[PDB]
Amino acid sequence: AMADIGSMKTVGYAIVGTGYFGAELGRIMKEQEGARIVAVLDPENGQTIAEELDCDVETDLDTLYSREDVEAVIVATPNYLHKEPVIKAAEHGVNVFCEKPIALSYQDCDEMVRTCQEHGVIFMAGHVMNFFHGVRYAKKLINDGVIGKVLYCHSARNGWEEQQPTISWKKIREKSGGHLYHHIHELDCVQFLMGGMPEEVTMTGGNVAHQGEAFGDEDDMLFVNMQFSDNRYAVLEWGSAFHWPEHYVLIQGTKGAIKIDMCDCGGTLKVDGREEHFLVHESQEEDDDRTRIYHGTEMDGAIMYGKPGKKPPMWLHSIMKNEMKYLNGILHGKEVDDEFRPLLTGEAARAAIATADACTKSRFEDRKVKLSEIIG
Amino acid sequence: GAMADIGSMKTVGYAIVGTGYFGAELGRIMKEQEGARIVAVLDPENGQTIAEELDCDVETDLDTLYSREDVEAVIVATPNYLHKEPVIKAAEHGVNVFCEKPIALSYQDCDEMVRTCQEHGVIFMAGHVMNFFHGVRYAKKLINDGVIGKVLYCHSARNGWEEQQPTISWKKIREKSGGHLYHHIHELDCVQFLMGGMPEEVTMTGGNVAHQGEAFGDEDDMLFVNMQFSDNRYAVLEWGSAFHWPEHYVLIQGTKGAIKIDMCDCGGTLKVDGREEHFLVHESQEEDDDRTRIYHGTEMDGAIMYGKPGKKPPMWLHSIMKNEMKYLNGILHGKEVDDEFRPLLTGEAARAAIATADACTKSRFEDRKVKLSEIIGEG
Ligand SMILES: NC(=O)c1ccc[n+]([C@@H]2O[C@H](COP(=O)([O-])OP(=O)(O)OC[C@H]3O[C@@H](n4cnc5c(N)ncnc54)[C@H](O)[C@@H]3O)[C@@H](O)[C@H]2O)c1
Ligand SMILES: NC(=O)c1ccc[n+]([C@@H]2O[C@H](COP(=O)([O-])OP(=O)(O)OC[C@H]3O[C@@H](n4cnc5c(N)ncnc54)[C@H](O)[C@@H]3O)[C@@H](O)[C@H]2O)c1
């Protein structure tokens, strides 16, 4: 509207990593008012996406970020290649949006957050599950006291992956971190719901059914047992060797419970002997579409993993728009909502990777691990 | 049966030690079995009443009871902490033993009970009655038949919401019941049956999160167990009484498919090769649906599901008690023990259940992962 003048500067975005997710974030951000995609860097797919978005290609991160028209960057490289794009952005005074998992070590994540703070640039952690209607609603119910004190969260993200003709980087521990880091969404969600990191974790599991030359080396079953301060608990399950598919977050408090189901897609509140239902995504059509995708891909979860040339489904495209609108607002000086502030302070980024590192160490060293061992 | 069953059957004389909710009903059931007689009961509070109902004698002393010429076997249905002396003294008198779960509240006790019965050459049947559920027998058949391939992972839950009762049952006193883990050991025994024995290593976490008014009972109301089995296999087991999202099931996941035994929304599911099949957990669709009705009635307070003297087990439980008492009576009339039930007679399922429960307990109290070798040694 006419009243927007004063607030509608064009923010120039770079995209580093324009595959499945980076190309689609670029498509979405290009459509946002006051945003332009000026340049992309992606050795394999940059030329193709630059032609689609009508923007430039760069090949060197310092050259890209030295451009006067590059003010912000969306970092959507593979999980193991987030650090250099973020560090060099901060060194050039470029504002950062970074895909999950922020990094595959706490040291990397800590350095990325710290370097952005030292250079006075924004660092937004792309923990997109926080934008789900169902998650926002669960947090509101908790804040409103509807389920009393949260005692216990149980998450699962369990399916069956068939042998593929090729092994994606997403299946290789050194490149993806495996399920715990690639699917860190659930861990971050539980930490948001329970008010931070646990004190101590145990993780068990292994590669039970995907060992050999035709498979990646990631664990295909992971089971986390978290002990929080003040006598509270969480159980988190992941993997790719489960012929009983489950994907949900279950929240149990002194007065009620909340389930966010992403397989039979929908939210349930139990309180005082009644049930209420709520949407996980932004419409019944989005929830029902997600249900159809899970039912259609039951015999092989590998089909849900993005790769260059593929497009995110309806529910994911829709929340990516919400998240890119939120980022664009922050970069046009809209005040950070309390609810999402931990995605900008570094607190959620550090907490997610600290706990993931503690779980990893617990599983590989076969012992309980205190978060203090990771964070100091 | 068969043509060979013609002729009078030898009567086996049964004692019952503990005739509360469960012992009184086991007596009613065994009395109806051919070739079985209930001859005497010992129960300080309820023995006179149950003996009048079953038309049998009352004893007050275990050695006197077992020295009776007519006592050949005993059903031990005392509270969880009072199983050892009735079993040991039965064995010392050459009396065959059926013992309620949990066999005992320590591995030392359980092991001594098994060893003493072996020393005296008497039968010792572990009353792990969940092995007599139609849906558990069917799940085992599917697994043995290779339908779901190698079992990789079992997940059990037995989670509800219990209100504090005006007066506290022995079942809520940890030294008397052993708390959820031992009083509801059914799920732990079920997982170990399906995964072929004890795990190598366990972790248990939990606490009294919502029953601070009952802290004197020293029981956790939430328990979470993480089991690591040999050859890269796992289990997760949940229990407790502070869960406003009720769940009671055993989920079995293998290389080729999965089986769920649901005891809340009562029914079995097989998932394999892109299809689902339904099967019964109990003896009929009516028994499953009755169990579902019971769980809907107890959702706001699971405390009402606990038996106490004067109460009768529900239909599904009466049915498996009949299955189990018929099995026991057959063994005591010289029927050969099936491979399926043999671990209930060898001591192996009894020792495995209590060994793992003790390891879980130690893990929770010491706040660390515990190897089963700490309990059982290096073999
Ligand atoms: N919902 C979500 O938040 C969501 C979903 C999918 C993926 N992701 C995240 O998005 C990121 C990318 O995953 P994806 O699904 O797009 O993977 P993808 O394999 O589809 O794309 C990765 C792209 O990175 C490019 N690339 C590789 N090395 C590079 C380098 N050095 N510099 C620049 N580009 C490089 C590749 O050429 C490719 O185009 C990861 O962090 C992943 O975890 C997030
Ligand atoms: N397998 C199952 O499905 C199932 C279900 C319920 C109970 N049980 C088991 O049955 C046993 C008894 O539980 P319950 O539900 O009947 O409890 P209950 O409280 O109803 O009955 C316990 C009985 O033990 C008697 N008793 C107490 N001390 C005794 C002693 N020293 N000698 C003899 N009798 C004594 C009491 O008088 C009472 O009659 C326990 O092992 C319990 O775990 C098993």
Numbering used by the authors:
A (entry chain BBB): 2 to 377
B (entry chain AAA): 1 to 379
Please share excerpts from the published article on this structure:
In the RgNanOx structure, there is additional density adjacent to the nicotinamide ring that, given the high resolution of the second structure, we were able to unambiguously identify as citric acid from the crystallization buffer. Using the high-resolution structure, we used a simple modeling approach to place a molecule of DANA a transition state analog inhibitor of sialidases, in RgNanOx active site by overlapping the carboxylate acid of the DANA with each of the three carboxylate groups of citric acid. Next we manually positioned the sugar such that the H3 of the atom ring pointed toward the C4′ of the nicotinamide, as would be required for hydride transfer. These models were then minimized, and we investigated whether the H4 atom of DANA was still able to transfer to nicotinamide. Only one position where the DANA carboxylate was placed on the 2-carboxylic acid of citric remained positioned for hydride transfer. The model indicated that His-178, predicted to be a catalytic residue, is positioned to remove the proton from O4 during the oxidation step. His-176 is plausibly positioned to undertake proton transfer with the O7 of the substrate glycerol that the mechanism requires. His-175 interacts with the negatively charged carboxylic acid in the model but could play a role in proton transfer at the substrate C3 atom. Lys-93 binds to NAD+, is part of the catalytic constellation, and is also within a plausible distance for proton transfer to C3. Lys-163 binds to the NAD+ co-factor and interacts with the substrate carboxylate.
RgNanOx (RUMGNA_02695) from R. gnavus ATCC 29149 catalyzes the equilibration of 2,7-anhydro-Neu5Ac and Neu5Ac. The novel oxidoreductase identified in our work showed to catalyze the conversion 2,7-anhydro-Neu5Ac to Neu5Ac in the presence of NAD+ in a reversible manner. The protein shows a Rossman fold typical of NAD-binding protein of the Gfo/Idh/MocA class characterized by a central β-sheet with helices on either side. Here, we showed that RgNanOx acts through a multistep mechanism involving a keto intermediate and cycling of NADH/NAD+.
